């Protein structure tokens, strides 16, 4: 069985490179961030523009939703994160502390915490209620490319251009494990699987790898795409068939069979690097976003 994703909507409106797209947990919305310093909110099923949220002084690298779909956090080149009320568009908190570009962000499942990673090589854990930094982790010796909580929020994984993925205890801020091999090329993205037992990591040698967290060993490698430069988002698609979904520097969305590692689809449409993909929480829907020569988001749907 293969999926049959087909283009349903093209979401135009950003005036510069799109940097991230994320579906709200309740499945109703898509948020996008851009080098044009804006966040846009769109209908998840029809691609209908809903609103623009503005306030950052420089480009935005990432956006992430709270578990109740009411708040957004954005990570900016202006060295700050902002927490937004989605329904009003108001900035509730500005999180200051990083000394350089903030590249990545995520809420924990309870959504009382935010984790951020920065060009300043640190990982920070922030209290949502107060906006206070709770912990600064001396995580890496190069820019932090991604940060992600596991399904119960007890662990954080961080990745970096230094080649390591590190798993941290959220409560204590101590490192529990480093995912490491004989050779360790730059890691451009990392995330836990939805079941919490595995980690997906992208390296800048055109490879994605699935690691067993318990054993600290690689189980599967996915190749065929191009990724030598950019921090490209990848995903587990779990609503229908079990796929790995990623963008690519050949401007395609790649879909692999999780178990066999075979490419099952390549989605064509974007006219620049597909920097971000996201998978809808309940329906077989993928969102893809592209850089400056394209500036669009595309929504794709499959029966499978
Ligand atoms: C909560 C949630 C709901 C889902 O439907 C779902 O597919 C996921 C998930 O993490 N899929 C992703 C996923 C599924 C299976 C495996 C896997 C690979 C090799 C050997 C064993 C296994 C296992 N086992 C890895 C990742 O978890």
From Swiss-Prot:
Changing residue 61 to F: Strongly reduced affinity for histone H3. Keywords: Acetylation, Chromatin regulator, Host-virus interaction, Isopeptide bond, Nucleus, Repeat, Transcription, Transcription regulation, Ubl conjugation, WD repeat. Transmembrane segments: none annotated. There is a cross-link at residue 16 (Glycyl lysine isopeptide (Lys-Gly) (interchain with G-Cter in SUMO2)). WD repeats lie at residues 13-52, 55-96, 98-138, 139-178, 182-223, 226-266, 269-303. Changing residue 292 to A: Strongly reduced affinity for histone H3. No effect on interaction with KMT2A. Its main location: nucleus. InterPro entries: G-protein_beta_WD-40_rep, WD40/YVTN_repeat-like_dom_sf, WD40_repeat_CS, WD40_repeat_dom_sf, WD40_rpt. The record marks 77, 103, 233, 292 as: Important for interaction with histone H3. One of its GO terms (molecular function) is histone H3K4me1 reader activity. GO terms for cellular component: ATAC complex; histone acetyltransferase complex; histone methyltransferase complex; mitotic spindle; MLL1 complex; MLL1/2 complex; MLL3/4 complex; NSL complex. Gene3D superfamilies: YVTN repeat-like/Quinoprotein amine dehydrogenase. One of its GO terms (biological process) is transcription initiation-coupled chromatin remodeling. The modification N6-acetyllysine is found at residue 82. Pfam families: Beta-prop_WDR5 (PF25175). Changing residue 291 to A: Abolishes histone H3 binding. It is found in: Nucleus. The keyword Transcription regulation applies. SMART domains: WD40. Contributes to histone modification. May position the N-terminus of histone H3 for efficient trimethylation at 'Lys-4'. As part of the MLL1/MLL complex it is involved in methylation and dimethylation at 'Lys-4' of histone H3. H3 'Lys-4' methylation represents a specific tag for epigenetic transcriptional activation. As part of the NSL complex it may be involved in acetylation of nucleosomal histone H4 on several lysine residues. May regulate osteoblasts differentiation. Belongs to the WD repeat WDR5/wds family. Interacts with PAXBP1; the interaction is direct and links a WDR5-containing histone methyltransferase complex to PAX7 and PAX3. Interacts with HCFC1. Component of the ATAC complex, a complex with histone acetyltransferase activity on histones H3 and H4. Component of the SET1 complex, at least composed of the catalytic subunit (SETD1A or SETD1B), WDR5, WDR82, RBBP5, ASH2L/ASH2, CXXC1/CFP1, HCFC1 and DPY30. Core component of several methyltransferase-containing complexes including MLL1/MLL, MLL2/3 (also named ASCOM complex) and MLL4/WBP7. (Microbial infection) Interacts with herpes virus 8/HHV-8 protein LANA1; this interaction regulates the MLL1 histone methyltransferase activity on viral DNA. This is WD repeat-containing protein 5. It comes from Homo sapiens (Human). The gene is WDR5.
